[PDB]
Amino acid sequence: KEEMIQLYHDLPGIENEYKLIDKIGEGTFSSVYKAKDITGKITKKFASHFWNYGSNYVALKKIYVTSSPQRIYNELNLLYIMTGSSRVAPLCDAKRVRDQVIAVLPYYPHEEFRTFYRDLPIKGIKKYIWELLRALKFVHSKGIIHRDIKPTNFLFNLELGRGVLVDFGLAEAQMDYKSMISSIQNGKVVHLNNVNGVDLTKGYPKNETRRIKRANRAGTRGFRAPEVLMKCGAQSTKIDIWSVGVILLSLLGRRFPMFQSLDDADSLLELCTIFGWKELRKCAALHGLGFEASGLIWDKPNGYSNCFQVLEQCFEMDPQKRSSAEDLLKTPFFNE
Amino acid sequence: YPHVYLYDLWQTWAPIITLEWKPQELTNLDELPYPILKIGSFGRCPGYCENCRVKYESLEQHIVSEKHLSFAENDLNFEAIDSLIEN
Amino acid sequence: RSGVNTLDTSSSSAPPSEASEPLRIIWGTNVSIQECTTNFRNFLMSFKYKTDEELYYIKQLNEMRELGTSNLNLDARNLLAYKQTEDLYHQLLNYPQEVISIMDQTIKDCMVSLIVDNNLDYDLDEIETKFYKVRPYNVGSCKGMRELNPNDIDKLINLKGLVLRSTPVIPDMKVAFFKCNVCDHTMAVEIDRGVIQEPARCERIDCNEPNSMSLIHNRCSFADKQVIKLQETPDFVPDGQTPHSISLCVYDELVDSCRAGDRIEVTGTFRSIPIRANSRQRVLKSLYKTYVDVVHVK
Ligand SMILES: [Zn+2]
Ligand SMILES: [Zn+2]
Secondary structure (H helix, E strand, O other): OHHHHHHHHHOHHHHHHOOEEEEEEEOOOEEEEEEOOOOOOOOOOOOOOOOOOOOOOEEEEEEOOOOOHHHHHHHHHHHHOOOOOOOOOOOOEEEEOOOOEEEEEEOOOOOOOOOOOOOOOHHHHHHHHHHHHHHHHHHHHHOEEOOOOOHHHEEEEOOOOEEEEOOOOOOEEOOOOOOOOOOOOOOHHHOOOHHHHHHHHOOOOOOHHHHHHOOOOOOOOOOOOHHHHHOOOOOOOOHHHHHHHHHHHHHOOOOOOOOOOOOHHHHHHHHHHHOOHHHHHHHHHHOOOOOOEOOOOOOOOOOOOOOHHHHHOOOOOOOOOOOOHHHHHHOOOOOO | OOOEEEOOOOOOOOOEEOOOOOOOOOOOOOOOOOOOOOOOOOOOOOOEEOOOOEEOOOHHHHHOOHHHHHHHHOOOOOHHHHHHHHO | OOOOOOOHHHHHOOOOOOOOOOOOEOOOOOOEHHHHHHHHHHHHHOOOOOOOOOOHHHHHHHHHHHHOOOEEEEOOOHHHOOOHHHOHHHHHHHOHHHHHHHHHHHHHHHHHHHHHHOOOOOOOHHHHHOOOEEEEOOOOOOOOHHHOOHHHOOOEEEEEEEEEEEOOOEEEEEEEEEEEOOOOOEEEEEOEOOEOOOOOEOOOOOOOOEOOEEEOHHHOEEEEEEEEEEEEOOOOOOOOOOOOEEEEEEEHHHOOOOOOOOEEEEEEEEOOEOOEOOOOOOOEOOOOEOOEEEEEEO
């Protein structure tokens, strides 16, 4: 109600361009409204889009002014160039003013994902993963890593079976090129092994982890890959498929609060709780950086199992085992 | 007492701290708190402006700031999308 | 939104107190570390001289990094312009000791954020390891050294005068070096508020002899210290008042920066200290001795 008037006051153009229908959602990164997109609006400009290939309702994405121009521009350009088909959201236009901006992204009817999360047959989940993993393969063909994979990031509609990606601001690319032209008491260091107390004994010695490593850590907690959790300086592609595996573990388990973690160390402790800290230390070591979990309490091997086996055996955290998207597609999911 | 820390095989790279005791409050021995997930834990009883690199508490306050106003009238970064839109 | 590494002085000043809704209010003071650092960062990132339109301090930091300088001269008057620092001004005047370290840490973190957020170059280890310092130089007007009261100790003030004498460089110990006269095991001890804790036992498990630690004088690490004799020239002079000369203490890089006959303006901290009655005993005199610690010289 107040939304139409305030948006008209800020942007008089939309008052004549569109009559805003109503608001359909509020994101932590932007706002989403639904508008009746029938002005002249050439159907060619609004054609070849995942919805019905015509001219009809277009959601308006109000982007918060706080976001950086470079970030918003990368998003609005990867909408335009690298996403125009293959079950992806296309963008046709955008309205800009001195400060604030809106994107014009065709509306896709959907429903809340918490409604059908425990009363849906297996075949529906099969086709859901089919659609998601096809979109993932197209994204990797484009060469970008989504890096922010969560249920809201992919809108779905069961009535029409529609599925489209959204809330993907954290999409970025791999290095895409690698160049190798050539090739007793001393202090608090005594704490356990030397390495435990090297940090304390000296005055904030060095600072590499957050200064010269500084890696990348963006996304949602509880969906990160072990390499990201360990803050490694090199990750190639498999974070997305690890997140997909987390999603399928969530869907095989009928319980709404899958993870309550909100910290990196807490998430790592959760991963050690679910899977043996022995193999966690093995993976951390083989990644190229050390690991030491001396926590006495809660060290016994974790319950591993106490369709399920085949779905649970596809969680391999090192880059020498796991396969590609079509490889996961090859498993039977397409009965008739 | 027990604890956890990740580090570097060479230690040239600074480590990651997870000093944790399930009995934090006494840091000796206790049972009430827990750092790990509980299978049943529903709860049942049984901003920052990167455009102006300044902290704030309410959006409207930051708008009236002189720095924020100065950028608004400055229109030189809008060529990017306009170039693609016209294409 | 930036990286941070704590300093030894910050850790030492860590011990907080309650009764402040932010928590972390240093006992005896009213300073709060979080608010002070946040206000300093905001002021640093947004301030123009009102050439009066450009970001005044962002450039200064840029040239500082480019040239390799480690000292930032801060006009204390500027803080009264910006609305946030209207209280940080009085906090800096009243509690310089903690505030200076807070600003220094904030400046180092600001430099790191500036270099990293723009992806200029990957050689950041040198700046990450080196030190920084901030020097106030435009404290408010004072009324002459005679007019300060005992309650003005450990405050920030400025003086004007004429230099007369300067004592030669005095070595000042910082790290003592002990040896065990039965196993050759050597230890190092860091001074703490002017007291060195001599070991009472060799820490080796094999060697545990009591009172076997001796001090090797040449193996210690020393600092630089100098004392200057200044003939002040206050602006306002009461009736029948004659001069004297004041003692100033200069440390580290400022030694040998003044020559007798120079006319200077100094900004420093007002101090006090008791003096031993005689070398033989260890009795002290009730009446204290005053001097100044130099933090900036113009
Ligand atoms: Zn702003
Ligand atoms: Zn010995």
